[PDB]
Design a protein around this ligand. Structure first.
Ligand SMILES: Cc1ccc(S(=O)(=O)Nc2ccc(F)cc2C(=O)O)cc1C
Length: 90
């Protein structure tokens, strides 16, 4: 049963999300492997390890390689403005 949540993070006080992403669509997809204390995601508290990362700032992370996902996340985090993550709960 579908369990989708959208998390908009104010990145005024945070310099990184503090997430590690594992796996990719072979369909499966890209998962939150771990969440690092000190990051925006940990502070917000809603996203948990095992959540599937679907979308960041209107970019579809479905059918995206792990390498590509890391590079896109880096580009987004290195630019100003709030970051909107949409995940499927485990
Ligand atoms: C410790 C640290 C800090 C910042 C970054 S980032 O600016 O390149 N952004 C990310 C990129 C990929 C990713 F899976 C997570 C992040 C993040 O902001 O936590 C990456 C990492 C590994």
């Amino acid at each position: 049963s579908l369990n989708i949540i959208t998390v908009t993070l104010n990145m005024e006080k945070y310099n990184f999300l503090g997430i590690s992403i594992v796996g990719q669509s072979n369909d499966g997809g890209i998962y939150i492997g771990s969440i690092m204390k000190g990051g925006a995601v940990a502070a917000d508290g809603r996203i948990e390890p095992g959540d599937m990362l679907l979308q960041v700032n209107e970019i579809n992370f479905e059918n995206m390689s792990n390498d590509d996902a890391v590079r896109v996340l880096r580009e987004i985090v290195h630019k100003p403005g709030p970051i909107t993550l949409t995940v499927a709960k485990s």
